[PDB]
Amino acid sequence: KSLRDQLVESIRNSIARNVFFVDGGKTTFINSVVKSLNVNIKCLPTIDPTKLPRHEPILVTVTARLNKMVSDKLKGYRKQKEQWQNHLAQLQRGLHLLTDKEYKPEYFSDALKLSIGGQDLSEIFEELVKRACEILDCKAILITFDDIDTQFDAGWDVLESIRKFFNSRKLVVVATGDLRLYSQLIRGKQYENYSKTLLEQEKESVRLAERGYMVEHLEQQYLLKLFPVQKRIQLKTMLQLVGEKGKAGKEEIKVKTEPSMQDIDAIDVRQAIGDAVREGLNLREGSDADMYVNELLKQPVRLLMQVLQDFYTKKYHATSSVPNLLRNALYGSMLSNIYRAGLNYEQHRFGMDSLCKDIFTYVKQDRDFNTGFYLRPQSESEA
Amino acid sequence: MERFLLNSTVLLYRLSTVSLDEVSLDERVESSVFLAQYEQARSLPDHVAKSAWSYLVQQIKQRNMKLGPVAILRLIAEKFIKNEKGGPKIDLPMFSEWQTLMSRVSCLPIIACHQVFNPGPASQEYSFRWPLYPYHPTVEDYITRECLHETHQHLNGSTSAEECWLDALKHPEACLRDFEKGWASQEMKQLCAQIDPSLTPRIFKDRLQIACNIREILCRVAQGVELPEWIASMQNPQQLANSTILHNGREYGFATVWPIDDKYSQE
Numbered sequence: 001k002s003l004r005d006q007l008v009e010s011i012r013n014s015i016a017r018n019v020f021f022v023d024g025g026k027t028t029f030i031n032s033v034v035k036s037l038n039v040n041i042k043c044l045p046t047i048d049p050t051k052l053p054r055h056e057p058i059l060v061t062v063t064a065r066l067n068k069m070v071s072d073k074l075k076g077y078r079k080q081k082e083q084w085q086n087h088l089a090q091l092q093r094g095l096h097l098l099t100d101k102e103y104k105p106e107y108f109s110d111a112l113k114l115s116i117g118g119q120d121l122s123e124i125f126e127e128l129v130k131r132a133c134e135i136l137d138c139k140a141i142l143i144t145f146d147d148i149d150t151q152f153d154a155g156w157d158v159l160e161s162i163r164k165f166f167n168s169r170k171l172v173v174v175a176t177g178d179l180r181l182y183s184q185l186i187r188g189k190q191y192e193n194y195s196k197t198l199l200e201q202e203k204e205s206v207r208l209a210e211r212g213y214m215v216e217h218l219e220q221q222y223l224l225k226l227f228p229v230q231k232r233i234q235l236k237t238m239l240q241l242v243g244e245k246g247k248a249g250k251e252e253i254k255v256k257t258e259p260s261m262q263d264i265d266a267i268d269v270r271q272a273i274g275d276a277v278r279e280g281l282n283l284r285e286g287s288d289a290d291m292y293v294n295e296l297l298k299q300p301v302r303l304l305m306q307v308l309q310d311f312y313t314k315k316y317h318a319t320s321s322v323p324n325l326l327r328n329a330l331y332g333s334m335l336s337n338i339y340r341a342g343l344n345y346e347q348h349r350f351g352m353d354s355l356c357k358d359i360f361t362y363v364k365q366d367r368d369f370n371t372g373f374y375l376r377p378q379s380e381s382e383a
Numbered sequence: 384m385e386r387f388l389l390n391s392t393v394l395l396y397r398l399s400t401v402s403l404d405e406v407s408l409d410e411r412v413e414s415s416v417f418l419a420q421y422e423q424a425r426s427l428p429d430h431v432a433k434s435a436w437s438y439l440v441q442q443i444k445q446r447n448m449k450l451g452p453v454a455i456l457r458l459i460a461e462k463f464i465k466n467e468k469g470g471p472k473i474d475l476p477m478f479s480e481w482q483t484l485m486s487r488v489s490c491l492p493i494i495a496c497h498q499v500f501n502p503g504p505a506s507q508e509y510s511f512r513w514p515l516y517p518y519h520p521t522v523e524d525y526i527t528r529e530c531l532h533e534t535h536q537h538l539n540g541s542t543s544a545e546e547c548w549l550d551a552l553k554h555p556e557a558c559l560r561d562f563e564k565g566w567a568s569q570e571m572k573q574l575c576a577q578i579d580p581s582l583t584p585r586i587f588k589d590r591l592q593i594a595c596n597i598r599e600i601l602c603r604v605a606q607g608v609e610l611p612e613w614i615a616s617m618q619n620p621q622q623l624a625n626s627t628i629l630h631n632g633r634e635y636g637f638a639t640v641w642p643i644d645d646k647y648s649q650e
Contacts, residue, residue, distance in 0.1 A: 077642050 001251075003236050004033045010231065011172060012039060015139050019162060019173035020231040025301050026147050026176050029235070033174070034144055041172075042069070042138040049158055050151040057098050058161035059125065062143060063091060066132055073136055080135050087128050094119045122165045133170050140170040147177035156185045159226060179227065187219045238304070239297030242270055245290060257312045273297065276311050280326025295377045299333075307333040337383045341365070384420060384435045386487045388412075388455050391419040392579045399593075399620045409440075412450060456496035459484075464493065464515065466503035472518045481515065489545055490514055491649065511650055513545065546649065552595055553647040559588045589624040596623035599637040606642075611635070 011020055022030065027046075034043050044065055052061060067088070074081050096107065097119070111119040129141060143166070148155035155177065162173055194211070202208070243249035254266035267275070273293045274285070283289040296304065307329050314325045331338070331347075339345065343361055344354045363372030366379050388394070394415040401408070413436060420432050439458070440450070448454035463481055464471045471494065473481050490513055498509060539547065551558040563584050565571045575582045600617075604610060613630040617623075627634040643650070 001032075003233065004029055004036060007033055007233055008036045011037075011142070011174070012041070014172060014231070015039075015041060015169075017162070017167070017173070017226060017228060018169070018171065019166075019175055019227060020233060021175040021177075021179070021227050022233045023178065023235055024147065024176065030144060030146070030174065030176055034142075037142065040138040041140050041142055042133075042136050043142045044069075044144055047143065047145040047158070049145060049148050049154045051146075052154065055099075058145075058158045059098070059121070059165050060095070062161075063128070066128070066141075070132055070135060080131075084131055084135075087124065087131055090124050091121070091128065094121050094124055097121055122167070125165045126168050129168055129170050140172055142172050142174060144174045145176065148181070149177060152177075152181040152185060155182065156189060159186070162226065175227070179223070179232075182227070183219055183223060186222060187215060190215045190219055237298075238269075238301055239294065242297060244294065246270075255308070258316065270297070272312075273308065276308060276322075276326060279322040280311075282323065292377065299382075303333055334383075341383060384416065384432065385439065385455050385459060386484055387416045387419045387423065389452070390423075390487045391415055393418045396581075402619045404618065409450060452492070453496075456493050457500060459493050460497035460501060464497045464501075466501065468518050470507060470509055470512075471497055471503065471515070473515045475517045475519065478517050485514070489548075491545070513543070513649070549647045549649060551591060552598070555588070555591045555595065558591060559584060562587055589621075592626065593620065593623035596637050599639060602641065602646075603639055606639075608639070 007020065007022075014020075030046060034046060037043050044062070047058070047061065049058070070084060071081075074084075093110070096104075098121070100107075107119075113119075116123055133140060145158055148158075158175075159182070166173055199211075202211075238253075241251060242253060253269040255269045255272055256265075257267045257272055258265060270293065273296055274289065277283055277293055277296070278285060278289050281289065281292070283292070299307075310329045310332065311326060314328070315322070318325065341362070343358045344350075359373060359375070362375070363369065366372055394412060397411060397415055398408075416436060417432060420427060442458065443450060443454050446454075448457065463473055463477055463484075465474060466472075491511065494511065494513075494515070502509070566575070566584055600614070613628050613635045616630040617628060622628060627636045
């Protein structure tokens with residue numbers, strides 16, 4: 001909202017690397033941002049890297065969307081068309097470079113045809129964007145890429161698409177995700193550059209150490225260039241968007257709890273959470289319950305929205321126990337969390353027998369051993 | 384006979400007089416066709432006409448189209464035009480009656496209908512070129528080796544009449560001026576009465592500007608642009624007899640944007 005607006009302003013005063021990034025929901029925010037831009041810059045349909053066959057280059061995908069946009073802006077109302085197919089064919093012909101698992105020599109004389117020397121696909125792409133903005137009468141093109149949480153590996157590829165092809169001043173990148181995975185993947189295939197025999201032989205702490213230093217420094221430096229900090233976006237969180245304990249509350253959220261909910265029955269968001277917990281927790285309205293719900297307002301918006309949408313849903317269903325309607329919701333919310341916790345899974349074996357053993361397991365895993373039975377969500381792990 | 388469905392003063396008058404919301408105009412259209420064939424080709428023996436009309440309505444119903452230029456243009460297209468060699472070509476056995484029909488109608492509509500509904504291989508980007516020709520390798524060879532030899536071309540200004548249509552639409556006021564200046568002459572009065580009894584320059588201009596409006600509105604729909612609101616108030620064809628339309632107190636001029644600079648080009 002406000003965040004997307006500042007971001008819009010930031011990219012706008014950028015045409016005057018060239019890659020804004022959004023930490024982190026994420027997709028909703030990015031879609032809203034793109035709607036915002038609809039100082040002439042033309043946007044691209046959002047790029048979902050995880051939603052692409054294992055064999056495409058980000059560049060081919062970009063070329064496809066660009067093809068559509070150019071062609072239809074062209075069928076709207078020539079020689080510009082005629083000029084475009086030349087670049088298109090040049091791209092097709094030089095396209096092999098990326099795919100080819102081996103160099104075929106015939107590509108040599110191919111490279112011998114005719115402004116840097118060779119068949120630079122990146123320069124070809126730059127004339128491509130030149131033609132595109134020349135024809136669309138736009139200052140630049142936005143390339144909008146989705147997070148790669150579902151496939152953090154394909155993202156690397158977009159990174160090289162950027163580095164090798166998007167070092168142009170009429171293109172701007174909008175990346176989204178967690179830079180931690182970026183770091184890992186870039187590191188992972190940094191390590192892949194070494195020679196297998198090398199590490200196979202030098203398996204000693206000393207040399208392990210300095211190569212780790214080298215790889216980590218290179219990862220850091222390369223992330224610096226690819227994602228220069230200035231244009232990165234931190235984004236405001238839901239609890240950051242909500243009063244910590246009531247001494248805040250820029251832009252009250254308010255949520256719907258009943259089907260009627262004629263915009264005046266909205267029971268805040270913090271207050272709805274507190275009711276759900278206290279009554280499902282039989283928790284009183286004291287300080288710990290508050291902080292309990294603060295350690296709830298962290299959770300990712302999807303998880304919290306599901307867990308608080310199945311809460312009142314089933315309460316209304318039963319009303320035409322709060323703790324069990326809420327317990328069933330927590331079960332779905334943390335199931336794989338609880339599943340990897342190694343704790344009771346079957347629902348037909350609830351009892352109070354399994355509860356004591358499971359509490360023992362939780363306290364041992366949280367270490368503690370002093371107030372673990374308090375079951376405070378104070379652990380470092382979100383699991 | 385379909386020529387009658389595309390050239391009929393009776394049908395034109397009747398349609399233009401009736402609103403856009405009658406529906407089920409079959410019988411009146413049929414009667415108009417009977418009349419028009421009577422005046423144009425009176426010599427037909429009074430039963431062949433009904434035979435043919437029944438035949439056509441037959442094909443229309445079995446093929447599940449409605450009585451309209453879409454259907455008629457379709458029928459004409461399959462009957463006459465084909466894809467061969469280069470671009471659509473007219474059948475050798477049928478060229479003569481092709482000319483008979485052309486004497487009455489314009490080719491471009493059929494040409495478009497055929498291109499849309501039975502285009503050749505999607506390889507030869509078709510550029511509209513009038514008129515239509517049959518194919519013979521022998522005649523083609525003779526032409527290529529010796530070319531044609533034009534001597535007598537003084538009929539209509541010096542161009543084909545079809546262009547005079549778009550020329551009038553681009554200079555509608557000039558068309559009215561020239562028509563009037565000549566309408567006072569007895570000859571042209573006789574000819575106008577002979578062709579359309581109740582023409583007069585007033586309904587002349589009305590028809591021209593109405594056609595302009597039709598082209599405009601159907602431009603909007605063809606480009607699929609939002610079907611402007613005033614189409615709802617657009618209820619009687621005569622409403623196209625004015626350069627602007629009154630929906631509710633507010634006047635709309637019909638003009639829109641066109642892909643090409645020359646909105647009046649045959650292309």
